[PDB]
Symmetry: C3
Subunit: 386 residues, 3 copies
């Protein structure tokens, strides 16, 4: 049998399976069924359905171990199930696919393909398989795996392309996301983008690049451009000390020696952290440049991969240079705090004795910020290092 | 009384409360009720329900000040209310909690806990309390406060962990977000991450750090690395001027004096903006370190 | 009438046209064209707001949004907060 309505049914201790729907049935409606099964010999389900396309609402029972068994799944306190195109709380809508819905939406919102949906939106369309549009207006999704959120006049027309808080904007890249933007058209793969009329910033997930059209800023009050150096013998060198090199490693600078910088605690920009992985995890040429292979992913993504170093051991638990003792942030350029002696004057230059500034030939003393005292054995001056 | 169906009812000037459901009632169904209340002496509600678990659809009326009062709340133009597990416009589904739903979804989408939901997705599972999965495939959420959007083979298994436009990826950090990524496993707390096979960029909300595996670029045509300096006497020094220092402050450079730089209008990278707060808002040591 | 509440608990409210709440507890939207999902103690009150996977989060300006945010407020025009705790934000076209 098929095409049957079962509504407003009460079962008082009647049937181990209360309502039962067989295999291959396309169209059944079950509403308002309530059963009692205390006095039944081994009751199973109040409602039972072998396939998933009967429609069900208003189920309650006492004494049945399962209120609903549908397509081999218990819904122990009942189910509300509708099949086909769905629409709730909307004023008007265009096309709705059987696996699409429109909710809380106005003026011709449309979800025309499988797994496409529109929420709380006006005049928005999706023909994207696996997609969501929400909190939006004049918007369209037409690729696949698209989400559009809190957006006006926004288009996502490529796979995994997405827009959040965007106006008059189009995301056309593979895995391409636009945020907090007005009037931008975007195309990169694995890119996060923002802009006003033109693209203004980019987070490139593919190559690991960060781009700003204008400035990048970091740091506080007096800051510097810095680089990680390794200390000779693995010593700790405190901040404010002038360092030199010996056997490729840093130590406190002595008389007549070249000052390469100052141990720094206030870098805005730093190089050579190895924050992600161990430094030798990737193959590098003789100049330190990464060696690559061109890979074309099964899908179609055409990228280049850094070559793995065979000597790399994924067992070894990586501790970054920022946590190691021997590795020091050394300020190379900028306004830097330096340990001085009694001989150092504002507006003058400095040489070094035991890593401590003495009157000399290098750089410029900007201002003494902590005057020398016999008891401390040093003062502190801001030195403009270049 | 309990377990009652009220359907296809028309009230022509009959009852101040049209349909009334008392306290402690678990199971009532109300469909297709239409009332007229012009000629009633002080009508209140077409439908009235003291608790929230009767189910309601197809309500209309004229002359009633409230079409529906449910659990002390007016729904003045009617309500459509279902309770329990919900499913609409989907081909198949696994487990659905009474406070879970599956919509516009295919092949065994499951929402097994309170406040878990799946939209427009295939073979996706959430057991995350307070979560959403949408526009997705082969995906799983299992922490709390997880959203997964436009994603394939994506896992969120920590609190507030989230993924948008991500492939074959896992976010395991506290408040940890992955964007526009393929094949990355992520763990930091208050981190935003992107990558292809390996993590390639990070926005650290916790410590205020920005990290790129490759390059950071800024600026235009001819650019420079720069720093904020304060002018002696508070003068304005125009761009293109060579500056020196005197009493820790900049002025135009003179003969034989040390040139420290040029007033710049085209910096790509700059230090010491104090863009966020006043410079002295935080305690610093003798070397300027926080 | 153009709002909904689904998979939600304790007094979730969607009081305006095109406002909706999903899988959330004690969350309110009075934002026209908005969504709150996977959330708790949260409120949207501007326009074009989405709040996702958030606790004690407020969006009270147009296109302001929060994802994976705690005890946080986005008040800027097209202003987005990510992966954050205890921040109040105000810039226009900013991600914070
Ligand atoms: N061959 C390796 N494979 C994987 N990890 C490694 C390897 N060698 C070292 N590490 C990791 O790097 C950390 C210390 O680095 P180590 O000094 O041993 O080598 P390195 O190449 O000198 O590193 P760095 O130059 O960063 O100091 C350790 O925590 C260890 O886990
Ligand atoms: Mg080493």
């Amino acid at each position: 049998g098929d095409a049957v309505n079962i509504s407003n049914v009460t079962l008082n201790n009647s049937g181990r399976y209360g309502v039962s729907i067989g295999s291959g049935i396309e169209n059944v409606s079950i509403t308002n069924i309530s059963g009692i099964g205390d006095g039944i010999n081994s009751p199973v389900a109040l409602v039972s359905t072998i396939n998933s396309n009967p429609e069900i609402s208003g189920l309650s029972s006492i004494g049945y171990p399962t209120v609903a068994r549908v397509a081999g799944t218990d819904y122990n306190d009942g189910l509300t199930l509708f099949n086909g195109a769905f629409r709730a709380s909307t004023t008007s809508s265009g096309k709705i696919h059987s696996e699409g819905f429109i909710m809380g939406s106005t003026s011709g919102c449309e979800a025309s393909v499988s797994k496409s949906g529109v929420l709380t939106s006006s005049s928005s369309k999706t023909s994207s398989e696996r997609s969501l549009i929400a909190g939006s207006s004049t918007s369209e999704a037409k690729g696949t795996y698209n989400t559009i959120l809190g957006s006006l006049g926004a288009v996502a027309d490529e796979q995994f392309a997405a827009l959040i808080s965007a106006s008059q904007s189009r995301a056309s890249g593979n895995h391409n996301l636009i945020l907090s933007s007005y009037g931008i058209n975007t195309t990169g793969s694995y890119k996060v983008n923002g802009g006003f009329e033109k693209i203004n910033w980019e987070l490139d997930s593919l190559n690991g690049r960060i781009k700003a059209r204008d400035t990048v800023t970091g740091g506080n009050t007096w800051s510097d451009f810095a680089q990680y150096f390794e200390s000779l013998g693995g010593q700790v060198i405190e901040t404010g000390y002038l360092v030199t090199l010996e056997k490729g490693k840093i130590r406190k600078a002595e008389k007549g020696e070249k000052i390469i910088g100052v141990i720094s605690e206030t870098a805005g920009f730093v190089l050579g952290e190895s924050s992600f992985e161990w430094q030798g995890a990737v193959l590098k040429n003789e100049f330190g440049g990464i060696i690559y292979e061109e890979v074309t992913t099964e899908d179609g993504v055409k990228f280049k991969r850094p070559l793995p170093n065979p000597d790399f051991d994924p067992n070894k638990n990586y501790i970054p240079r920022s946590q190691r003792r021997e590795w020091h942030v050394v300020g190379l350029l900028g306004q830097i705090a330096v340990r001085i002696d009694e001989t150092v004057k504002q507006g003058h230059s400095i040489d070094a004795v035991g890593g401590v500034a003495t009157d000399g030939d290098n750089f410029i003393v900007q201002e003494i910020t902590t005057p020398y005292t016999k008891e401390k054995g040093y003062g502190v001056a801001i030195v403009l290092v270049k």
